[PDB]
Design a protein around this ligand. Structure first.
Ligand SMILES: O=C(Cn1cccc(O)c1=O)NCCc1c[nH]c2ccccc12
Ligand SMILES: [Ca+2]
Ligand SMILES: [Ca+2]
Ligand SMILES: [Ca+2]
Ligand SMILES: [Zn+2]
Ligand SMILES: [Zn+2]
Length: 159
């Protein structure tokens, strides 16, 4: 198994906020994306407003200080680093995308579910129903569920 957090209590902090969205919608989207993974694991996520967090959430564009430059509108929407110190765990969202609460532009909640999967140690799935499938697909966020493969993958890492 690839890297995993060696603790079940994991902190996050939002570094900065996309102008594309209301601030409170960003907080809600991120909180609900952590909750999707909380619901199927023993992991507990604590938001910190200031100071050291395991998972830093960043919106940035182009070359943004890691060795993994973003590519402008479309192509790569986001990435995340597997568990570890420093940049380990951190999830980055390409600000050249138009982040939304809905089916237009790029739905932040769905993208954050995928990226936090990476932040917890998952790779891609070959199952197109899996949130960890490599490509973005809008699905009704009211009806959203992790596939059986996403649950198998995260439970093989934690519990
Ligand atoms: O950034 C990407 C990969 N990607 C590359 C070129 C064109 C794309 O449309 C695209 O999704 N993947 C991370 C976001 C993602 C990957 N799988 C998902 C499933 C649901 C929601 C979001 C995602
Ligand atoms: Ca980190
Ligand atoms: Ca991009
Ligand atoms: Ca944007
Ligand atoms: Zn990055
Ligand atoms: Zn991915």
């Amino acid at each position: 198994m690839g890297p995993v957090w060696r603790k079940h209590y994991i902190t996050y902090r939002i570094n900065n906020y996309t102008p594309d969205m209301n601030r409170e919608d960003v907080d809600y989207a991120i909180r609900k994306a952590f909750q999707v993974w909380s619901n199927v694991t023993p992991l507990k996520f604590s938001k910190i407003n200031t100071g050291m967090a395991d998972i830093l959430v960043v919106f940035a564009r182009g070359a943004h200080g890691d060795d993994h430059a973003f590519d402008g509108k479309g192509g790569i929407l986001a990435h995340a680093f597997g568990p570890g110190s420093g940049i380990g765990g951190d999830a980055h969202f390409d600000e050249d995308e138009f982040w939304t609460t809905h089916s237009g532009g790029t739905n932040l909640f769905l993208t954050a579910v995928h990226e936090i999967g990476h932040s917890l140690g998952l790779g891609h799935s070959s199952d197109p129903k899996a949130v960890m499938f490599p490509t973005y697909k809008y699905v009704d966020i009211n009806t959203f569920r992790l596939s059986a493969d996403d649950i198998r993958g995260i439970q093989s890492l934690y519990g």
